[PDB]
RNA sequence: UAAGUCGACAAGAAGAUGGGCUUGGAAGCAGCCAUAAUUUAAAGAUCUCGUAACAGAGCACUUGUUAAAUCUUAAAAGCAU
């Protein structure tokens, strides 16, 4: 069978690393050939920003793999201006019925779903439906919407 | 094999099977199960 | 207190339990055959979930690049690949064609104040519909002189319908060279512009679908049939180029 | 019985005979019930059984057919038969024609299988004897049924062959019972592709 | 039905043909993953003016090719066929395997 | 001026290419009308509703006809042919065919409520 | 329940999205909080396994094939085991 591994990485950090190293490097495809490959499709994207990444291992350990948009719960905290949390990265709430963390714009909401309809298996559905994903979200991470 | 008095199913894979009833006894009734051998019972001694 | 004759408005005696999907998706189909006038017949062959988004991305964006000059409304997203089922789809064709609500007689309906209301139950749904496709589908070789007996050979095994809202030749052909391509009557989209068409799930998703037929006005069109009406232009010019003459 | 209801299609070669009610008597028996004889002859040989009076067969041999059918569906007797009945005559007509396979794996260390012939224990002249060793002190050594034959392609394969399935079936359960698979490590005989799920360690 | 065994399948019917019907099930029953196993397939649809006799053609991987016609054997008689000569291969396999 | 970013509100955190800025708000009027109702999807003190709410519903009931209190049975239970005609028009084949996707959502609904009510029935 | 019941078999069982929190690690499946949506033939921020954590195999659910013309499922009661 061909094996596919999820993982989420920096922009340009491409190396042996836990994020890297154990994810594909215990199963025999080259890694070292995967971070220079890397750094070529991720060359335009601001150093740190995380990079979720869909690769796939065929038969005889012949790696592909497509460059997958930023995740929404990324973007959503980034864009409500949360308050960074332990380790430098901004945190949800650990309470979505009660704590609010941040409240962002409708129109905010509607530039955030642009950016992720760029993917293709993602740029048949309509827009008008996409919004709406994303508000489906922040009520699961504690952000109110404001009109 | 654990002998009750109230024989039940704990999957999907148990059934019940009246067994070594011939012209001689009337049996007994028992909950085979191919995948795990632990829910074996049977209803009755002899 | 209601009383136990009293029957919900919305709501007359149907042939069969209407909770149940089968008959609610039955009365589902039913309208769809009478809203939709252009229908193509298609095949499914274990189609998986991407490979099923892949397919429908394609007519989304293809479908988009039709011109409106009439100023009709914007067709652009009524148009949807549903997958059907046959089972209960081969009997809304027996409906539509061997029941008439006109050969149903009024009767008294009692509301939940008591009162003797005079009602007319024509639903498809209803036991007289059921006892005319019955009545009607005995004759064999009769049935198949109409539209729905040369259809009956195509409801088999998986069926993908293809829905428009109107006759309009012009989404036809932004469909018929996605899903079917016949070159070059309707040549597929090129690589340099449509690099989402050449991918490796679409790719193996359109090999899977095979057009079987087509059902237009409620008449039977085949495969080499449909290429004629796509081949046309648009239908307004069709009936000028008639008074030029 | 949705079994008994379907046709049994009788391929080229095939010959159903039809016997007629007969009562053979039994002193220790008040009442036999008749039977009817059905032989199935054909290219690798000839079986016979003998069915109940209450099962009709409605031989066509225009259209090589034949359709069971009971007197009266609300006996319970009458309507396990059929279904029997049915099983059985479809595994002759297959039987008789292409012949039923049976393959046992033996797996395990030192495991091993040959025919050969043991005229002193010879049940009937040239019958074949399937010699394992299985890790047991002394050779264990079996006469195959006469109407069977037994063959080893390798020394942890054996292929039995024979027109009954009933009887090839039941001398590889009796192979079998000399090492049944153990769940640690998967030895022991495995008849027709049987397996067994082993354990973590 | 086992597909393992099928190397490629051609199909020719006609839509229309009540006949064609079995063959047309024939293509369902095969697994998503067959054309990226490396089996060719290919499917020729015949006009509803003029309908031809519906060809069905099967090959294994022993170089075995088979034809059978749609019209007197239904469905459940092809799949009959396809089921006995791919069964031989299984187990020709484990006779000749380790 | 019905949103609370004016033309000009600049969307923090929105841009992860380095060689670009953050998106910047766009006029109202220019954003499409569908945002604006896409949030139609949102949703002692005992004593005091007794003495005022239970009082209150029964007035504007007016329990005297059996019309106010009929069944009202929901659509994913129904059997009236929904609005199709044949040879109906375009503005009739748009409209039968958003009934038949407002019938998708009552029976999508259904099937919520009981494949978490059979898993609530497993995990006792 | 021929609008194919029941059973079996074939395929599917998606996407936003590794929900947020917690944790060395928690990705449906240790635990806590939330669980209006979206798109579909259908698909629970998840019912039983599996993984250190992913992966993976099943279920709910969806389509198709086979096939019953007194033959589906459940309950209650009577007499038995
Ligand atoms: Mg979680
Ligand atoms: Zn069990």
New interface residues.
Partial sequence: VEQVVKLIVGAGQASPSPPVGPALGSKGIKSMDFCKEFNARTAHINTGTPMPVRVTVRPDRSFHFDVRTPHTSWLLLNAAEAPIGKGGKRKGASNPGKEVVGTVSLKHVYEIAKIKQSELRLSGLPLEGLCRAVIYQARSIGINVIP | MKVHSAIKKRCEHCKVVRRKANKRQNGYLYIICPANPRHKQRQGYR | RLPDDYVPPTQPPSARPVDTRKSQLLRTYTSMLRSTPLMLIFQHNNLTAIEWAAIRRELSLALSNVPVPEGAPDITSKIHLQVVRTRIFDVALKTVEFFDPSTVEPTTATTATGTKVPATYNHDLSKHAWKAVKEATKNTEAVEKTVYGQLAPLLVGPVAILTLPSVSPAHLGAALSVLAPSPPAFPAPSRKKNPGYYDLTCQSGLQKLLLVGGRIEGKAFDYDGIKWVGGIENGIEGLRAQLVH | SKLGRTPLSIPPGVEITIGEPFVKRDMTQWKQQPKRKITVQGPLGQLEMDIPDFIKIDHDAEARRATLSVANRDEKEQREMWGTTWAYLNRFIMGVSEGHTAVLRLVGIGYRATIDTRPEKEEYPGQQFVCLKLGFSHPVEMGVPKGMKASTPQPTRILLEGINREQVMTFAADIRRWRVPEPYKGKGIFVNGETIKLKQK | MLTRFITDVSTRFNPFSAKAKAARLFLSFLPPNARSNGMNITTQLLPRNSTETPLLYVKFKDGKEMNLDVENMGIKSIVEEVDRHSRILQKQADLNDG | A????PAG?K????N????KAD?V?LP?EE??E???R??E??KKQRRLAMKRARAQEAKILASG???A???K?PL?????????????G?????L??E??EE?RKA?RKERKAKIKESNYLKAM
């Fill in positions: 019905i949103s609370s970013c509100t969307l923090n955190g929105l992860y290419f380095k060689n998106p708000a109202d954003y499409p569908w945002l604006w896409c949030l999807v949102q006809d059996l019309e209190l009929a069944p049975i994913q239970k129904q059997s009236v042919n929904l609005p199709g005609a044949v040879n109906g375009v503005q009739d084949a748009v039968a065919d009934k038949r019938l029976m």
